[PDB]
Amino acid sequence: GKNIQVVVRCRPFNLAERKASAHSIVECDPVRKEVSVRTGGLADKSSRKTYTFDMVFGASTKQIDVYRSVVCPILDEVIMGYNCTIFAYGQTGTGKTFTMEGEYTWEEDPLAGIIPRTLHQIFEKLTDNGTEFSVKVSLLEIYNEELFDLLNPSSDVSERLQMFDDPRNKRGVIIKGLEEITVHNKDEVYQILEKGAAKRTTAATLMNAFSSRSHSVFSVTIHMKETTIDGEELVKIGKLNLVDLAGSERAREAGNINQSLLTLGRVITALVERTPHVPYRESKLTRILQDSLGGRTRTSIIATISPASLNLEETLSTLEYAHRAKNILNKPEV
Ligand SMILES: Nc1ncnc2c1ncn2[C@@H]1O[C@H](COP(=O)(O)OP(=O)(O)O)[C@@H](O)[C@H]1O
Ligand SMILES: [Mg+2]
Numbered sequence: 001g002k003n004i005q006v007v008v009r010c011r012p013f014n015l016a017e018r019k020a021s022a023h024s025i026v027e028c029d030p031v032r033k034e035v036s037v038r039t040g041g042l043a044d045k046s047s048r049k050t051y052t053f054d055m056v057f058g059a060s061t062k063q064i065d066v067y068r069s070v071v072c073p074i075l076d077e078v079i080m081g082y083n084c085t086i087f088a089y090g091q092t093g094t095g096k097t098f099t100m101e102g103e104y105t106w107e108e109d110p111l112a113g114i115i116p117r118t119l120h121q122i123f124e125k126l127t128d129n130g131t132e133f134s135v136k137v138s139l140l141e142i143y144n145e146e147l148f149d150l151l152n153p154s155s156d157v158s159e160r161l162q163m164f165d166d167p168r169n170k171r172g173v174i175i176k177g178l179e180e181i182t183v184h185n186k187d188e189v190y191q192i193l194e195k196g197a198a199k200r201t202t203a204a205t206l207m208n209a210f211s212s213r214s215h216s217v218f219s220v221t222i223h224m225k226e227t228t229i230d231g232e233e234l235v236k237i238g239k240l241n242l243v244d245l246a247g248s249e250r251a252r253e254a255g256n257i258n259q260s261l262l263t264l265g266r267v268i269t270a271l272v273e274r275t276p277h278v279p280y281r282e283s284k285l286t287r288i289l290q291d292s293l294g295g296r297t298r299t300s301i302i303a304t305i306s307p308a309s310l311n312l313e314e315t316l317s318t319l320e321y322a323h324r325a326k327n328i329l330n331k332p333e334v
Contacts, residue, residue, distance in 0.1 A: 007055035022308035028058040081236030083292035090304035092247035132225040143209040150196040216244040
């Protein structure tokens with residue numbers, strides 16, 4: 001494809017779908033990279049709609065496999081000194097958070113998601129090659145188009161963060177007062193995710209800013225300096241934005257979400273097709289990530305879906321959205 005990769009990840013059935021007597025309507029073919037949905041209504045057992053993506057992950061797909069296939073290529077980009085972004089898009093309950101952060105010593109938990117493994121690899125790789133480096137991370141939430149710092153020890157209330165341009169080459173934004181925690185070792189990441197989780201819970205309870213209706217943006221910035229005898233030194237800065245989007249399924253409270261997700265989709269489609277003018281300025285989410293989506297870089301979207309007939313509507317909606325972002329045509333022979 002391109003620098004923009006769109007993959008789909010289907011989760012296994014959950015308890016509620018079993019108790020509701022739901023049926024599997026999704027078929028994943030990792031070889032042909034297709035996802036086909038049994039769409040028939042009453043008496044219609046023949047009509048199915050197929051879609052093609054850069055990759056397709058079945059329900060048995062393991063955390064490490066999503067990481068190996070989707071993130072490794074991207075992290076190598078970041079290490080070379082680039083800004084990249086990874087998205088988790090889909091219906092609430094389909095695995096966006098299970099995928100972005102997931103759920104010992106140096107060996108990674110098999111349920112660990114993209115975030116634990118990523119920090120993990122930063123330290124292993126930069127330590128192994130003797131690079132001089134420092135790693136800082138920030139975690140903010142976007143709810144009803146307002147920013148909240150999830151790692152600020154103090155200034156913890158329902159106070160939003162001020163966003164604004166900045167005298168410098170455009171595309172960037174400065175988020176006034178964004179807490180940026182320095183990480184000293186790979187394991188220190190779980191403690192960071194704990195603080196975030198605890199503060200998100202507070203915002204949920206004290207604002208109704210439920211995680212399922214918000215965008216979580218966890219950014220890791222790596223400052224690197226590498227040297228070799230008869231090879232000159234290098235100063236690089238890499239940044240990876242790991243985004244856990246709001247569920248794709250109050251009046252405008254659902255408008256801001258529905259709108260930003262549609263704006264995001266338009267920004268992605270504009271980048272794939274190279275149409276002048278990409279609508280970054282139309283949403284807080286795309287404005288904040290412009291600097292990473294703007295310049296040349298690797299960008300990936302992980303579309304999560306349910307396999308049950310109970311969620312057919314949202315699954316088709318998600319597949320259509322993923323298809324619209326990067327139109328890949330189905331190949332011959334079914
Ligand atoms: N692919 C998966 N494999 C195993 N469990 C998953 C998978 N995807 C989601 N889950 C499970 O579903 C729930 C997590 O869903 P979650 O990540 O919160 O979805 P979302 O973030 O989109 O709301 C947990 O029970 C989690 O273990
Ligand atoms: Mg979630």
